[PDB]
Amino acid sequence: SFLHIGDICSLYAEGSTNGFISTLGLVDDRCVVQPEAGDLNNPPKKFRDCLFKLCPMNRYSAQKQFWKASTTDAVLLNKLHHAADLEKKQNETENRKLLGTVIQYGNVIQLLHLKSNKYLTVNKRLPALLEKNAMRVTLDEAGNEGSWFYIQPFYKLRSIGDSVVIGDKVVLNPVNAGQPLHASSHQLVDNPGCNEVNSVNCNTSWKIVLFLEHHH
């Protein structure tokens, strides 16, 4: 039972705080873990909100150049706009070819939160809202380089190059945005009950729990 691009899973954190990554609405871009909401044997009531789709690494170079422009030249801006469209089209095409391919440890993936249709994203230039020395994690619709994560093995049963097995505990390590995804114990003031997910050197493990195979 291996994990594939296109599979839909939930991510269960095991750390100082245990729980599935979830969100706080369609507008609020904060990611959290609610320990009391549920666990592996007793999953939370709103599980629709804990679902992520495993996606390939999107190209963002042309998009970034365009977003960046800024610029006064309309001719240039149109060339960049076109290039960004060709890039988005290439992601669409290539990502379709990758559907159903097995994910190997060391691969770069993106995590699409299905309910909000946004990617889990690390912001290398922003501190987390609560945990001081950590970097901020947010939900971003288009995503960016901060949405790129290496999926690495938490334990040595499997190594880089091996297929990721369902139920495996992994490290979600940003490619260049910062440190591993962390399930902190920093409780949100406004909410219960919810603890901040951020990016910082940590020992959190993330268990990949399969919900639906890609072909569905």
UniProtKB/Swiss-Prot annotation:
Function according to Swiss-Prot or TrEMBL: Inositol 1,4,5-trisphosphate-gated calcium channel that, upon inositol 1,4,5-trisphosphate binding, mediates calcium release from the endoplasmic reticulum (ER) and participates in calcium oscillations. Undergoes conformational changes upon ligand binding, suggesting structural flexibility that allows the channel to switch from a closed state, capable of interacting with its ligands such as inositol 1,4,5-trisphosphate and Ca(2+), to an open state, capable of transferring calcium ions across the ER membrane.
Domain comment, as recorded: The ITPR1 structure has a large solenoid CY assembly built around the central helical bundle made of the C-terminal domains from four ITPR1 subunits. The solenoid scaffold includes domains responsible for binding of ligands and regulatory proteins and is connected via an allosteric nexus at the cytosolic-membrane interface to the transmembrane channel assembly. Six transmembrane helices from each subunit form the central ion-conduction pore.
Species per Swiss-Prot/TrEMBL record: Mus musculus (Mouse)
Lipidation (S-palmitoyl cysteine): 50
Effect of residue 50 to A: Strongly reduced palmitoylation
Post-translational modification: Polyubiquitinated. Polyubiquitination targets ITPR1 for proteasomal degradation. Approximately 40% of the ITPR1-associated ubiquitin is monoubiquitin, and polyubiquitins are both 'Lys-48'- and 'Lys-63'-linked.
Descriptive protein name: Inositol 1,4,5-trisphosphate-gated calcium channel ITPR1
Annotated ranges, domain MIR: 100-154, 161-211
Family: Belongs to the InsP3 receptor family.
Quaternary structure, from the entry: Homodimer. Homotetramer. Interacts with ERP44 in a pH-, redox state- and calcium-dependent manner which results in the inhibition the calcium channel activity. The strength of this interaction inversely correlates with calcium concentration. Part of cGMP kinase signaling complex at least composed of ACTA2/alpha-actin, CNN1/calponin H1, PLN/phospholamban, PRKG1 and ITPR1. Interacts with IRAG1. Interacts with CABP1 (via N-terminus). Interacts with TESPA1.
Locations listed in the record: Endoplasmic reticulum membrane; Cytoplasmic vesicle, Secretory vesicle membrane; Cytoplasm, Perinuclear region
Superkingdom, taxonomy of origin: Eukaryota
